[PDB]
Structures are given as structure tokens and as C-alpha cells.
Design a protein around this ligand. Structure first.
Ligand SMILES: O=c1c(O[C@@H]2O[C@H](CO)[C@@H](O)[C@H](O)[C@H]2O)c(-c2ccc(O)cc2)oc2cc(O)cc(O)c12
Ligand SMILES: O=c1ccn([C@@H]2O[C@H](COP(=O)(O)OP(=O)(O)O)[C@@H](O)[C@H]2O)c(=O)[nH]1
Length: 454
């Protein structure tokens, strides 16, 4: 029997997009989806609704919280420092969520962040499902009970090693453990410290789910199931679905003028702005490679145009070989273009999947975020599908020479590290695209959802 599922993702394109990818897969199986989305953002999402008779959008008015810029709905609309206020605004949709649930009456609601929700749903006879599109290795590392019980005694040296029982080994740099130790305590919406919030969601929800498959995410989901004592499901790897919009002709035309596999694509997601010095170092490192490149970057901190922040003489030197662009582009379609030979990525969970299912060599440039860092360690050291750009142990900065070297290594047909990461990437792509991998993940996922509402 088909399920009625409501979708309440965090107000971020990196959550809205994979929730919609998964929605399409569930609707193909006959399930009815009530998709809650910020009102103005809906128009950008219709693009991806492949089953409009089963997937219905319901608009949310993102309320006012003092400090929130006017009209802002998504982390793509605000600077990263304003994220906690946007969290307070999502907390404030409670009364209009509670009324949407009362009239739509879904059996299950997938959600992010709103740890108050399982108390509404238990009252309405609805099952709460905390559905993560970030890595379970990240939640396992920072938010498992052993971490939470040390409370404010948790230090940088504590975060340098995994929590007790953690199934895997990898190394953090000093500045990364420093980042995790401090940001953990910073308020993220309505006065709740960040890790407390996520922990409250894990503890109070009926069940948990993650993007991923047993072959890669398995050990972390088993660890989390053992720790929290409730089902931790895997949706499958949420392979990107095809959009209804073709590749913009101006990009298709420009990309079509380069030799196959010759272009370096660089993008750091839609939520981040580099500091100027690292913006310069990145762009000069791309220039040093001599390869054509497309860099999708916001202007650096303190700057409003790409023009004003480019290193001196940059435009005149790179000529038609390189473009630096700050607008939203169709990243998934660009990564499928045969010109692209290399993807320099901030290691966001969605960008990681998009690179894995394509042919591009991966260069890992994780930005200062626990999931990006952990994704980078897993891709660089466990799966060994990419080369990570070296950062200063204490300052977290890279040089233009380190960017150049990483790209050169993976682009060199005769370099043995490049051949190795190509070979390992092919292994992972062949697994994720295996004819029965995602479908069998979804088979199990949907059975376990049926048990949940039984
Ligand atoms: O990056 C993280 C993250 O997601 C991310 O949290 C950012 C705020 O810190 C936000 O800006 C991004 O849009 C979002 O993808 C979340 C998260 C996401 C959805 C949830 O339902 C609950 C938690 O937990 C984290 C926990 C960590 O120990 C470290 C992290 O790095 C993240
Ligand atoms: O100009 C852009 C920037 C991002 N994306 C998409 O936005 C999502 C970004 O998610 P990810 O987790 O990689 O990073 P974030 O942007 O949340 O940091 C992915 O599906 C990208 O393909 C896109 O299509 N165009």
C-alpha cells in the first residue's frame, strides 16, 4: 500500500535538491509526497518535479526574525553568519506546519533540525523521520552520545580522535578539530547550541535515515543504530534525476569549444564566500595549470563583484581559457559535459555524489565545515577517489602551488596517483550506478518505512 509522506527539509538548496531527487524516486513507486518549501523558492524547484500528480508543493512563509534580510528564504540568500537566524525562522514555522499536518494527514514526515516536531507528530499519529543528506560519518563523529555526555568539557584534543566505538579511522588537522570544538557550542536557532539541536532531533525522532548505501555508509549507520537504539535507514545514494530544463546554450556552446576532458570545473556550493587571499590563491593556482577552467565562486568577503576581486592582470592573461562566474549554474549538467576532466570541489555531500557518478577527476578542497572535512577524508583516504589540496595544519590556508599540484597530478595521464584515483573512482561509479544498487536500497528503505507506520 502506497504511503503519504511529507517532506520538510532545511532551507538550503543542498537539502531541497536531494529531498526532491528522493521524492521523485518515491513517487515513481506510487507514493504521494507533500513537499513543504519556502514560497518564492518553489518556482526554482518545479524544474525537478517529475511527478506533479503525486508530488505537490506546499508553500511556507519564512517568518521575520530580527537580522534576517528581507525576503530571504534559503542559505543561498544569506551569508553563512546569518544561518542561525534562518534556523530561528524555520523554528517559527511551527504553527503553520502544525496546520499543514492537521489537514494533509501524512503517515510520515521527513525533516531536518526541528526537534520540536516529533512532539506534534506523536500527538497526530504521524511518524517522525529525521532524514539526513549529509554523511552519517559526520553525525557519528560529532553527535553520538559519548560526545554529548562530555557536555562543555569537550575540547579540541577530544575532537582529534573518534568517539568510543567509531567504526573507522581518519585524521583531522589541528585547525579542523578547533573549528569543531568551538562551533559545536554556538547557537543555531532559538538559543539552542548547534550540536544540542541535532542531538535533540536524533533522540526524539521515531526513526532516522541517511542518504547512502551499505557499501559506503553502512558502518556508520550500524554504529548510529547501536548507539541510539532506533532504526537508522539508508535511502540509497540519491542519484541525481534528470531536470526538465536543458543545459543553458551559452554554457553548452562555450564548453563545446574545448577538447574532451581538458577543462577544470571548480565550484564551492551556494553557501560560502572565500576570503580574498584564498580566492586569489585558488584562481592563480587554476591559472598555473594551463588548463581551461570554469570557476563558479561568489565574490570574496568584502567584495561585491568578481571583477573587482580578481588578481591583477588575471582577465588579460587567461583570455578565453578561463571564466570566473558568480551566478547559479546547472552544475549537474556541467559535470556531465565531456569537456570536464577535473572537478575541484568543496566536498559538499551533493557535489560529491554528482562527481562520483561522472568521469571527472576529483580534487578535494573542503571548506571549513564538519561534513565537508569528513567527506574529504573519506574520499581521499578511504575510497581514494580524489586528491586533497594541502592546508596549513594550524591556519587552514592553502597555497596556489598546492592547488596547481593537485590538479596537475590528477590531469596527468602518466602520473601514478592520478591513474590510481581514476581507477578507484571508476570502481565507486560502477557500484553507485549498478543496475540494482539504488533500486535495492529503495526496496529495503520502503519496506522499513512500511514497518515504521505498522
Ligand atoms: O554540516 C552539518 C550539517 O548540515 C549543514 O549545517 C550547516 C550549519 O552549520 C548548514 O549551513 C548547511 O546548510 C547544512 O547542510 C548538519 C545537519 C544537517 C541537517 C540536520 O537535520 C541536522 C544537522 O549537522 C552537522 C553536524 C556536525 O557535527 C557538523 C556539520 O558540519 C554538520
Ligand atoms: O551554482 C550552483 C551551485 C550548486 N548547485 C547544486 O547545489 C547543490 C549543492 O549541494 P552541496 O551539498 O554540494 O553544497 P552546498 O551548496 O549546500 O554547500 C548540488 O546539488 C549542486 O549541484 C547548482 O546546481 N548550481
Amino acid at each position: 500500500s502506497s504511503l503519504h509522506i511529507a517532506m520538510f527539509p532545511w532551507f538550503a538548496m543542498g537539502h531541497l535538491i536531494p529531498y526532491l531527487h528522493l521524492s521523485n524516486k518515491l513517487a515513481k513507486r506510487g507514493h504521494k509526497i507533500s513537499f513543504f518549501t519556502p514560497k518564492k523558492t518553489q518556482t526554482k524547484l518545479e524544474q525537478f518535479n517529475l511527478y506533479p500528480n503525486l508530488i505537490t508543493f506546499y508553500p511556507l512563509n519564512v517568518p521575520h526574525v530580527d537580522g534576517l534580510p528581507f525576503g530571504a528564504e534559503t542559505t543561498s540568500d544569506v551569508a553563512i553568519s546569518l544561518g542561525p537566524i534562518l534556523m530561528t525562522a524555520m523554528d517559527q514555522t511551527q504553527n503553520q506546519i502544525e496546520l499543514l499536518l492537521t489537514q494533509l494527514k501524512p503517515q510520515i514526515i521527513f525533516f531536518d533540525f526541528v526537534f520540536w516536531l516529533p512532539k506534534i507528530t506523536q500527538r497526530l499519529g504521524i511518524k517522525s523521520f529525521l532524514y539526513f543528506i549529509i554523511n552519517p560519518a559526520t553525525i557519528s563523529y560529532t553527535t553520538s552520545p559519548p560526545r554529548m555526555f562530555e557536555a562543555e568539557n569537550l575540547t579540541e584534543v577530544d575532537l582529534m580522535k573518534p568517539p568510543k566505538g567509531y567504526p573507522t579511522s581518519f585524521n583531522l588537522q589541528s585547525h579542523e578539530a578547533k573549528h569543531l570544538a568551538s562551533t559545536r557550542k554556538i547557537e543555531f536557532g532559538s538559543g539552542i547550541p548547534f550540536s544540542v539541536r541535532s542531538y535533540n532531533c536524533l533522540s526524539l525522532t521515531d526513526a532516522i535515515g541517511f542518504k547512502g548505501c551499505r557499501e559506503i555508509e553502512g558502518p556508520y549507520v550500524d554504529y548510529l543504530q547501536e548507539q541510539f537504539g532506533k532504526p537508522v535507514l539508508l535511502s540509497g545514494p540519491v542519484l541525481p534525476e534528470q531536470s526538465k530544463t536543458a543545459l543553458d546554450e551559452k554554457w553548452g556552446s562555450w564548453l563545446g569549444g574545448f577538447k574532451d576532458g581538458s577543462l577544470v570545473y571548480c565550484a564551492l556550493g551556494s553557501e560560502l564566500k572565500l576570503k580574498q587571499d584564498q580566492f586569489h590563491e585558488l584562481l592563480l593556482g587554476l591559472e598555473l595549470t594551463g588548463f581551461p577552467f570554469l570557476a563558479i565562486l561568489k565574490p570574496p568577503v568584502g567584495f561585491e563583484t568578481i571583477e573587482d576581486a580578481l588578481p591583477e592582470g588575471f582577465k588579460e592573461r587567461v583570455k578565453e581559457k578561463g571564466i570566473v562566474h558568480s551566478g547559479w549554474i546547472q552544475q549537474q549538467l556541467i559535470l556531465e559535459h565531456p569537456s570536464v576532466g577535473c572537478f575541484v570541489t568543496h566536498c559538499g555531500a551533493g557535489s560529491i555524489t554528482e562527481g562520483l557518478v561522472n568521469n571527472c577527476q576529483m580534487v578535494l578542497l573542503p571548506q571549513l565545515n564538519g561534513d565537508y572535512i569528513i567527506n574529504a577524508r573519506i574520499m581521499g583516504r578511504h575510497l581514494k577517489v580524489g586528491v586533497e589540496v594541502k592546508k596549513g595544519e594550524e591556519d587552514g590556508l592553502f597555497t596556489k602551488e598546492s592547488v596547481y599540484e593537485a590538479v596537475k597530478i590528477v590531469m596527468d595521464d602518466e602520473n601514478e596517483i592520478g591513474r590510481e584515483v581514476r581507477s578507484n573512482h571508476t570502481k565507486v561509479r560502477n557500484l553507485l550506478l549498478r543496475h540494482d544498487l539504488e533500486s535495492s536500497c529503495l526496496d529495503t528503505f520502503c519496506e522499513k518505512l512500511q514497518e515504521l507506520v505498522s
